[PDB]
Design a protein around this ligand. Structure first.
Ligand SMILES: [Cl-]
Ligand SMILES: [Cl-]
Ligand SMILES: [Cl-]
Ligand SMILES: [Cl-]
Lengths: 213, 213, 213, 213
């Protein structure tokens, strides 16, 4: 009955969130670049997860993902906007323009295009609205060496969450963000996302940070 | 089987947290200044909550609360360090020294003394450790007018959480903090605290903020 | 012609700020617990600094400091609210109640009482208003081990600055804060404070952090 | 004798910083898209400013700017990495992919490419190192409505500053950031940048925020 779209759903925290949302009774659309790993996530769910190979850096592929979801399930209540690539851990001035662009497109442009499509879908549905949960950094309180593209784009996600919360309110869209760091088992990020998605629309975890050890 | 001490348990979020922890199967000690309101919380729980009238600004009363808890339940796994008073909303220079001292003692000294006693108890028990959850501000992203004592002491709680996490690690003590603000139903703060207390000791929500509307 | 009160002026950053403000042409009142070290700061200034032994944790002593300043110089344009004591670096639960109270009184109550007296004086003078610069932490981005009283009270100063900025605006009082940390020569904190005090009242450095190395 | 490169130097804060650095005795290279406005900045300086029309979103144009600077002046001690465009204030889902890409390229890719070229130049020169000052947001404590591309990319600049400080240390490169907001005369941002550039390399203002009124 509540419907989620989970990006990066073929691996890691995306897979764990999709499995945990389905266990909590959501209908789930699984978005990611490769069908094989999406299929294994759907097998784990063992219900009616929908696999949707998607390039979230591509506006048309993104639109197609939400259309497929609404066609199958009827609406979209939650988006877990989950991306996380890094460039190689090399001196910053050795990064090529393409290595830079790959991290910006994956970590920042993908989440922004999915947030735009979520606004289009959520504002149109009835009852109106929903929630977007953005997956932030895995090094929250301290950047790793040689990480400027990853650190800049995950900080950009904090700005995107803030503007999405402000701009979503008119459409009954809430937005919050989860970050992790180290002083981690993906199950704990998934249970936190399930918790955040459990709240009614007028209460919202805007930011939370979970620390390992 | 897991044991919690909840301060401010006779009202508001303290009562809601105590009721929610007991519903999740915790043994609960209810600490607060007045027995009457503690009794009503224990009636709501309708199990074996322990009422312990306590002045958390007083070291001996604090020690007595933890001793009563360990005597009854055998150990203390979670402390919800919950205080929240304000001075009158008047020009800052009109505040009397006693009105200032009342907010510092209640909002900062109480939580610090309970954290010290929690370290004494948690480091001594077997298995060792536990978690302390500090209740932060209700105006997280923007201070209200005429609120310097409340705003300074709730910001102090953020510093206390950070030092408690660092200093607790050697004793297997984790510490995290919850804050709220407004762009709220106490049930949502209670379910967030239950969530935070649900995690094993090596994963910890160090900070989370829930926003109304 | 612009007049400053500098607390902790007998040593360290307080002395360096007082010397730098006087070098920039301010009249300076030097506040601190011991006359000897205040005298040496006044000798360094070698002009007309006013030594005022003061206990900033005491409301009457604070009032006396501002009265002495207005008597001598005619008004108070800038307050450098500068305190910074720590408790011993020992396990938190070994701190005595008096060791805790000493850090709260020095690092939080002193600055709050000086801010109240500054509001009384600044709102009354003509032209009205002025600026208060609060000296924050020396470990800004990471607390040291065994530092809960210092870390909680310097975080409290951030809350005090925020409320002082909001509440001061009606009186043409601006408030900002300086913090330092380490990835330091007191001359750099002093030149930053001089910079902050140089701005007209409608532009204000609300926060700045200077990092060593 | 100290040499600065100032981007966006044909207008607004970029022009004011270039004029103020030259007034403080720096040699200045003026980078911006249009020669006309660069010329007017150079006329204001009325000394030996070097105009260098540059597209900072283009790696070759960026390299050419630093090469022109080193050819003329001999080294580069300070970079003011200054960009700031917004997309139209319209519903987020109405933004075209090109309007999004324009803000990411200008506000995030330009500063990243200039930081890479600054590392190449600063690490190679003798004495080695220098400082990079990134111009952050003009709405620091609260995003404006309809501003997700601007808010995300200025938050990204905070991440870039943090990684640049960490990664620059081995090359004696310091990095800090200035932000502004409103509870402003460009002269105050320029005097703050001059202040930040005045410090020796082992002390660094990593972040400062100036608030209007
Ligand atoms: Cl990050
Ligand atoms: Cl607060
Ligand atoms: Cl601190
Ligand atoms: Cl911003």
């Amino acid at each position: 009955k509540k419907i989620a779209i989970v990006t990066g759903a073929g691996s890691g925290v995306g897979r764990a969130v999709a499995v945990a949302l389905a266990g909590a009774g959501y209908g789930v659309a699984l978005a990611g670049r490769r069908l094989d790993a999406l299929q294994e996530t759907a097998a784990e769910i063992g219900d009616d997860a929908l696999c949707v190979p998607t390039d979230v850096t591509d506006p048309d592929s993104v639109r197609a993902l939400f259309t497929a979801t609404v066609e199958k399930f009827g609406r979209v209540d939650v988006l877990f906007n989950n991306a996380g690539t890094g460039a190689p851990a090399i001196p910053m001035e050795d990064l090529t323009f393409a290595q830079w662009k790959q991290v910006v497109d994956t970590n920042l442009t993908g989440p922004f295009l999915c947030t735009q499509e979520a606004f289009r879908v959520m504002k149109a549905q009835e009852p109106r609205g929903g929630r977007i949960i953005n997956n932030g950094s895995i090094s929250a309180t301290s950047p790793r060496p040689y990480s400027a593209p990853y650190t800049a784009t995950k900080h950009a996600i904090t700005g995107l969450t803030k503007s999405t919360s402000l701009d979503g309110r008119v459409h009954d869209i809430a937005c919050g963000q989860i970050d992790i760091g180290n002083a981690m088992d993906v199950a704990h990020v998934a249970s936190a996302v399930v918790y955040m998605a459990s709240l009614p629309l007028d209460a919202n975890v805007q930011f939370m940070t979970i620390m390992a050890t």
